[PDB]
Amino acid sequence: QTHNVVHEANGVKLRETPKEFFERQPNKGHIHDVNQYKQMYEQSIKDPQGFFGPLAKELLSWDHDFHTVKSGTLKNGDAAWFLGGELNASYNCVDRHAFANPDKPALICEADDEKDSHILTYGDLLREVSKVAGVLQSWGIKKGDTVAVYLPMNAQAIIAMLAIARLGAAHSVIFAGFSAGSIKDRVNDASCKALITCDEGKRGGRTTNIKKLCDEALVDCPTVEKVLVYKRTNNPEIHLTEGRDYYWDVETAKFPGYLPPVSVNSEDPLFLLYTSGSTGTPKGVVHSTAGYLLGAALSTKYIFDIHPEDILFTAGDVGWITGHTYALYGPLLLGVPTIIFEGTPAYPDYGRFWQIVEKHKATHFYVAPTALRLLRKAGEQEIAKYDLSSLRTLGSVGEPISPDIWEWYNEFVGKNQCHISDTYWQTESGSHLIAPLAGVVPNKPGSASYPFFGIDAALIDPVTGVEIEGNDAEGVLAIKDHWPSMARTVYKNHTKYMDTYMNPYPGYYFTGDGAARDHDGYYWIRGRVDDVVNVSGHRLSTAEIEAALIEDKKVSEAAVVGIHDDITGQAVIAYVALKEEDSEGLRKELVLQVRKTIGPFAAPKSVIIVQDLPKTRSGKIMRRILRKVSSNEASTLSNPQSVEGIISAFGAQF
Amino acid sequence: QTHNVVHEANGVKLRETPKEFFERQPNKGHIHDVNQYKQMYEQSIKDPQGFFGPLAKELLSWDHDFHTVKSGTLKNGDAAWFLGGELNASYNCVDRHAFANPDKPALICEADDEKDSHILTYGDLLREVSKVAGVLQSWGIKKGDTVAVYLPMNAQAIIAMLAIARLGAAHSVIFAGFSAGSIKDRVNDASCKALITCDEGKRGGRTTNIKKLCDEALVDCPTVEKVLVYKRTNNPEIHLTEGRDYYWDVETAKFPGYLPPVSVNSEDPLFLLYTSGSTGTPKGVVHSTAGYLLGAALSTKYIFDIHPEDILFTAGDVGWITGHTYALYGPLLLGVPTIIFEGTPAYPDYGRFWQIVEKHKATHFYVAPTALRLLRKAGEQEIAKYDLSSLRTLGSVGEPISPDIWEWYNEFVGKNQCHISDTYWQTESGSHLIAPLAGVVPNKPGSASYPFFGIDAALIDPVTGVEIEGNDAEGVLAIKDHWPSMARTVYKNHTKYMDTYMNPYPGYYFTGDGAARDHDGYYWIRGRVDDVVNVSGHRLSTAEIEAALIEDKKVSEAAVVGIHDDITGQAVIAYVALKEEDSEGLRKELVLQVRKTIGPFAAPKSVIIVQDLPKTRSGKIMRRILRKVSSNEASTLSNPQSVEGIISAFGAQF
Amino acid sequence: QTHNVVHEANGVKLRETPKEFFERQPNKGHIHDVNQYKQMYEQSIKDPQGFFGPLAKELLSWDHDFHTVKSGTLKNGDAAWFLGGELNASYNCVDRHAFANPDKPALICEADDEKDSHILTYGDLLREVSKVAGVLQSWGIKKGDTVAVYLPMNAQAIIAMLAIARLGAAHSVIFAGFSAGSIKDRVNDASCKALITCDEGKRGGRTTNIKKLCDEALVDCPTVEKVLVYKRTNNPEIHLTEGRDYYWDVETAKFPGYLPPVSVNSEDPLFLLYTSGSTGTPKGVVHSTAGYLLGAALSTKYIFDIHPEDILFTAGDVGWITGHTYALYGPLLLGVPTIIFEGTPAYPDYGRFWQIVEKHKATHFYVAPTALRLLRKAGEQEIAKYDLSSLRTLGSVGEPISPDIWEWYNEFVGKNQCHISDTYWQTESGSHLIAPLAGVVPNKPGSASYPFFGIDAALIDPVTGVEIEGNDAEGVLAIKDHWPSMARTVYKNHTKYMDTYMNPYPGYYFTGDGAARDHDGYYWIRGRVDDVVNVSGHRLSTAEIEAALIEDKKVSEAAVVGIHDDITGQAVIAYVALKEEDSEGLRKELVLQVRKTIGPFAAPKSVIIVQDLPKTRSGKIMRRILRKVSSNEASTLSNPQSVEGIISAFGAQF
Numbered sequence A, B, C: 001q002t003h004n005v006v007h008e009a010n011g012v013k014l015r016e017t018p019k020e021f022f023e024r025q026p027n028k029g030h031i032h033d034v035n036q037y038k039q040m041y042e043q044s045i046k047d048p049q050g051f052f053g054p055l056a057k058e059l060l061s062w063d064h065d066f067h068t069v070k071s072g073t074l075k076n077g078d079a080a081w082f083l084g085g086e087l088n089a090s091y092n093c094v095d096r097h098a099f100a101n102p103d104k105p106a107l108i109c110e111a112d113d114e115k116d117s118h119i120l121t122y123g124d125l126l127r128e129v130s131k132v133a134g135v136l137q138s139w140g141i142k143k144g145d146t147v148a149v150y151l152p153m154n155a156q157a158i159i160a161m162l163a164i165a166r167l168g169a170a171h172s173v174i175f176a177g178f179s180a181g182s183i184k185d186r187v188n189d190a191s192c193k194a195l196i197t198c199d200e201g202k203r204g205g206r207t208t209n210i211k212k213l214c215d216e217a218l219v220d221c222p223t224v225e226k227v228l229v230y231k232r233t234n235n236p237e238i239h240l241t242e243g244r245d246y247y248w249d250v251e252t253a254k255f256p257g258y259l260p261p262v263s264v265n266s267e268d269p270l271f272l273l274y275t276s277g278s279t280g281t282p283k284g285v286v287h288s289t290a291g292y293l294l295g296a297a298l299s300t301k302y303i304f305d306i307h308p309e310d311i312l313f314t315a316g317d318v319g320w321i322t323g324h325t326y327a328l329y330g331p332l333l334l335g336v337p338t339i340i341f342e343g344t345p346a347y348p349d350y351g352r353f354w355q356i357v358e359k360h361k362a363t364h365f366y367v368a369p370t371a372l373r374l375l376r377k378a379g380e381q382e383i384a385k386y387d388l389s390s391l392r393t394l395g396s397v398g399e400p401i402s403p404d405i406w407e408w409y410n411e412f413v414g415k416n417q418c419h420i421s422d423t424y425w426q427t428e429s430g431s432h433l434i435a436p437l438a439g440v441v442p443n444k445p446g447s448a449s450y451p452f453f454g455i456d457a458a459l460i461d462p463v464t465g466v467e468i469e470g471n472d473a474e475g476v477l478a479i480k481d482h483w484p485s486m487a488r489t490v491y492k493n494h495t496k497y498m499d500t501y502m503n504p505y506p507g508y509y510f511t512g513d514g515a516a517r518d519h520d521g522y523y524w525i526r527g528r529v530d531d532v533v534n535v536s537g538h539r540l541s542t543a544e545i546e547a548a549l550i551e552d553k554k555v556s557e558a559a560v561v562g563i564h565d566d567i568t569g570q571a572v573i574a575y576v577a578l579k580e581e582d583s584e585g586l587r588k589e590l591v592l593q594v595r596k597t598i599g600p601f602a603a604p605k606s607v608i609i610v611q612d613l614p615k616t617r618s619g620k621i622m623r624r625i626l627r628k629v630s631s632n633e634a635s636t637l638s639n640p641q642s643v644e645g646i647i648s649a650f651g652a653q654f
């Protein structure tokens, strides 16, 4: 007790799981007592073979059984799960459920306008996936090909990824916010032979350009042989390059309503998803087929307490890992309907999220902390109008949750009845690492609680590189052994995959996050230790933004850091130095330069112009100074007078 | 009793199964009583899962077992059988039998001249198929490729289709009668990467040109990379385009006598077979692998009463669905020798069919009604010379059988000892739909008796579109649910497949045939309701013939209909109107224009030339008038005087 | 007794298996008594299905089980084993052992210099094979592709063949001694899409050129898309053609440490290996996957008495069948470490072979008789310095072993404690045919003893073509039925495969060797009957050397034969006749002409020049005369005076 190192633990008492939730369970809970979970967790770490074997056979339908549950080491980067097994993601997500209950809802597609909303049953999802998959096969997509997807968060993207996996190909979903240059690089890296996109998207009542950005990047993408285009708005003046572009509706009507699924090996690539790390250009994270689906199945069934009668709503976009796991695979593997929203929580009214939960009587809701802050400041009153009584579990993902936000979440939406589960994980983790299991774990506000099955959490001292033992401790967060849903490599570049995750601390998986552990065992996440800032959930490497600013001929050097913006969580500020008029206009010109190389979400909130940057004698720009200058101004540098200049221009600009 | 609507049922008494047949059975009959069959049939309709499951495991050797017997609906066009199963057609047709009895006869190849006849054992068929398959594999044929076959009805074609299926490819047999333009269209549609043909064919003592027609179409077929040519006559002056054409004997000698078969999914395409429907160009009918072979195995074993000691003779050509199912797959699946005839029933003498039955002591004989009429008028006396005592079952296929022909069949050939089984089915049906089961069902002459296992027959009123209930009823014939051997789609054009079979009467499979059902339950087929005429067994769309006539610049409009010709069953007459001398010569010039675009069997018997066609005010040519004018002349038209002109020119011409 | 025909059997007594060996067995011997072996052998011949079935399931890990143990006949050339089975060679050789004992040694790589020696564990071999296999897959290598290997006898070649088989591709190892023209022909025949080689090799302290010879042949090899180059010496001035050549270290670092193995059918090609027969250019011998690995597993486990605790040293190069079977697959299948030597038994000292046996405490040693003669004449004394006490079994392979050499082997190296096993077999045989089983069979010096499991040995009279029955008999050696590891065909040329092995004596496998059988049943090999001479183990067709000499414009005709050279066993002499000065220099010019078309090992020891060759009236060069002229001069020819000229020039030259 009386924590000294973990200051956040002090003054925090366990918020017991509300009693109303256990009554709203449609069936007996998967786990009875919290002591039962600790016994399950202890087995997954000590005996991984005896723990995950049965669960894999229970939750996955195998075309061919595996001979070995776990192989490989973190140090050697040769991890593998369920070796010898053969299965298919589209059979487990669609086919098997469509045979039992064809008319059961599968995709509840809620569009930007509710007039364009519709529901697809599992029988319908099987027919549409088979048809789309039939088109890609006639085009020549085979096992081992990568197929790119540039679609908004609607049912069409869900259908696309399943049809690609159905053939044994790997899908690479590119976020619709990205620019043309970001599509160019990502496609060329994967050597995609096909692209699935739409004519244009509609979000918040505005018509976003989609196909036009694809045509721009595709002139520099020679691997793409053919492109599939969906008529989301049916705009007549949308050009389609002959021989390359073909129409979704026209081609799918040519092929039958059932296509045989292609068996893939357990360690065969399921998908690629590009993320930006502290150093280097965005890398292509690869996930295996079997170990990923299992991880998604476990975390969904047990942490969220998902039963066959439940309905899940996950707000995240499929362009990021959250939509991948807990808007598609997780729910569909368990045979429950998932809610896919193509709009924003503000259009038409700020209660749009809550109409959907009322309309479809959703039982589980998954949201990012950046959206809860937006709703509180803007549309807090609308919540009471809608029912929201069907919700049993409220989740949080992507950003640190504040105790202030946690209490607002519990009563304003859950009415002190729902269970709150702060789910900490990563794109590379595939599934949840640390989260409160609903009905089991009493959550401490702000803490992600205990680690999940198969995750052996530990802290490491950053300087000495030793594992810290005990409680009331702080350090770098790392995992001792690999787990089923762990990412297996970076596409065509395993060396950077080792240099990033396995080599910083050999024998450990490097998460890039600082954490603390209290005496109760609950884990507190303190943010990323490398040069990555979480801006509205999007991870952004400072180096990617800095390289975009330097593309302008005038920019001699640039440096970007992050600070706490209330709405966005973190915002990147740009301190740029020019070589040798209209200073305010050039600042805006740099903002679109970042918006052109990367996308609109990378644009800095402000750009401060200084002649000299705070540098050490060797040359390293003192990012610690620029960080504090943004907030509070209170070591050895080259010129200290330059610091007064940076403070002068910061107030002048921001 | 006392049928009013079904006039054919009146005056017809059951012709009981002859007692001599049961004694000639080499073993106990598959079905004991007719009540046993009705119980089997009732199960196949009520419980399809419990009926076809065991039969599939019994009659098919699976590389991998299936998880679901039946999926999909007619309304959605997503039918599938034995989902998850893996198997290969060449293993079930050749390999497994060759292991048990290598020296057992498999292909009894009876050529145009008996001096060129030979027998291939199952061990020989395994070696020749493996070698041919070895050539196609080195050429690059893989699972999912289509391979065209343009061969006469000999052992080489049988070997070809097995070698193609062995690799998992799909074979498209093109009838040797077709012209070059028909090969052109069919090949381009399937995008065949290879072609198997012969130098030239010999039929009825005449040397038919084969390779030369292939070279003509192949200049407009870019997908064909290589061609395999068999030396049927070894004509020295047969050109072989270098890089494309290679020799059957030369290449097969390069590869070993065993090649591993490639596993295909149950719903993977087995073959394509092009047929002409009332509307549109000829379409590519697709059949699955597993559901087709089962249907062929069931219909052969039970309707024909085929036992391991039996020998089957089916006269049909492999260019049509009859040779596909009951000259190749059906017999070979059950491990019995099949008789392949490359000649005609007239050369050398009209008793050639009966020498073969005597020579090889055939037990089952399958023939079309168009051949029975030819033999009766020309060579009726030769039958008594040959033994023909080994025959147990006589079959009829393709055309309506007349009660006059049925009685001639029973005594002149069967000697009132064989069982006659009128087998009604379709290219799309894959296997028999309605037929008398030998040893079980007493056949009514002219009636195809009761429907077969898994076929839920029903009649629909054409106008109201309602299912007719009761007996003494007539209407459109339709099947309530799909069946294993049902065709799954039209190649690369599922929309026309729905528009033709599933959309005319939703929830039903449209057969395109009129039928009647008497009080005993026996079904009577009354012919096709759409614009298709059965000329000597070949289904011919009127629109395909009309489009060929219109290719001549002079032809303004044309219209073709059918009437009863004794020899051909039905003959198509052509009424053509020219724009603006040698009228008799231009009539002959049009006949070869049809023979050039389609083939020799489409040529009209006569061509009547009129200036105006009987038309409604909207423009539809009154095909009912041209139909009656051909036979007996006894509504609102545009000009009635034109009718007197059509009658005047009909007598003048025909 | 008192053998008359088998003169070698007379005066020979059984040398009983030394008692010390049974004590040095780490476990109970696989076979207890010699009578037990005869009962096992009798079953393998009478009931092949009941004998090899269990052994295949015991010694091989199957991805899918087979349905038939044995099919096909020698006469039809359609042999097949374990039909229907699916497996992978790299799983059985690496993966399965790496799971049980990752840190167990697998490849003990002893380089030309011991400073460059290293050991790879089974876990390491799994990671390196997976990475290399990962590179070939991204390059596009798939099941059915051939990949060429031009590497010396080191660990890199072993890794290469496993990675190729891992993908289901077939590897074609080309011996590093061969010239550029020999690589050209071999690659073009197989149509290899990739090549794995190294910058240069080091052997006996000399730097051999390797990559440079590849670049020379690759300009005439269009099928090769990409090439993998290993940095054996890291010579900076090694050119790498851009787009074609890539670096082993650079590419393998890009791919992960585990790659899923690809299932292949039992009869799918494992590898190709080119050998030269009496007639024709070198042919590509093909071996199946399953039947080969089993044969290698049986012969290694039982003839050599290999147990899990044993260590094997086989001196042969992987460029020939010996390194294939008993330096790679045989040991690795059984999960024991194998010793790979990149040097020669003379460098640094003649006791290098024996340091390795002492260093790694090797228990089994495999050597060719040509090396035992070299060591005896040059470095006999070094043997006593090293321990060599861990050896239990000494083997002999490739050449006839002399009784003089057999006794030297037994005491000078084995110290009358090891068991000597003369293993006679062929490239086409895949595994041992006739050999003494250690611990079971008392070996007669010079005799290979009894045939092995599944080999039904018999002798045939060369003239009459009848099988000789009884003992004290001599004739052509042939095998009555095929066996699992028998070669299945010649690549893309099955006709020559039949003409060579199955057609000379139908119903028998032609070995090309003369043999004798004594009253005890022991077999004595008397050499090859066709025009093939074993020069230092390399089989060399006389026709291949003769064609190389004739390439020079001056050479009108040439004829080469073989005689007994002490060091090389057999040496080829060249008698060449020119069309029309510096006679000694042209003789040397011809020697390099052979060294350029074939390789350095084909160069004749001497070249005798004569104007006329001893010829029959039809024209056949009397090779019997040139054979005797070389040794002792003691029929009807065209000119007898030419014989005096050949004798005159032989003494003048050689």
Ligand SMILES: CCCOP(=O)(O)OC[C@H]1O[C@@H](n2cnc3c(N)ncnc32)[C@H](O)[C@@H]1O
Pocket: A275, A320, A321, A322, A396, A397, A398, A399, A400, A401, A422, A423, A424, A425, A426, A427, A428, A448, A511, A512, A513, A525, A527, A528, A534, A537, A538, A539
């Ligand atoms: C999985 C969401 C999308 O993942 P990304 O790969 O884009 O970003 C992962 C990072 O988000 C933060 N993070 C994620 N979840 C939480 C969380 N629940 N609490 C605090 N920080 C969190 C942690 O810093 C982590 O390293």
Ligand SMILES: CCCOP(=O)(O)OC[C@H]1O[C@@H](n2cnc3c(N)ncnc32)[C@H](O)[C@@H]1O
Pocket: B275, B320, B321, B322, B396, B397, B398, B399, B400, B401, B422, B423, B424, B425, B426, B427, B428, B448, B511, B512, B513, B525, B527, B528, B534, B537, B538, B539
């Ligand atoms: C299966 C033979 C070749 O089939 P096709 O696809 O070429 O033609 C099918 C049509 O032939 C007629 N037909 C077929 N068999 C009979 C039959 N036994 N009696 C009467 N009409 C028949 C029916 O009209 C049917 O729609």
Ligand SMILES: CCCOP(=O)(O)OC[C@H]1O[C@@H](n2cnc3c(N)ncnc32)[C@H](O)[C@@H]1O
Pocket: C275, C320, C321, C322, C396, C397, C398, C399, C400, C401, C422, C423, C424, C425, C426, C427, C428, C448, C511, C512, C513, C525, C527, C528, C534, C537, C538, C539
């Ligand atoms: C397997 C070694 C490499 O094989 P190759 O395919 O290069 O050569 C096979 C031939 O070598 C001889 N031969 C092989 N082993 C022996 C042996 N043990 N004794 C005598 N001659 C032998 C026999 O003549 C045989 O036909």
Ligand code: NA
Pocket: none
């Ligand atoms: Na399989």
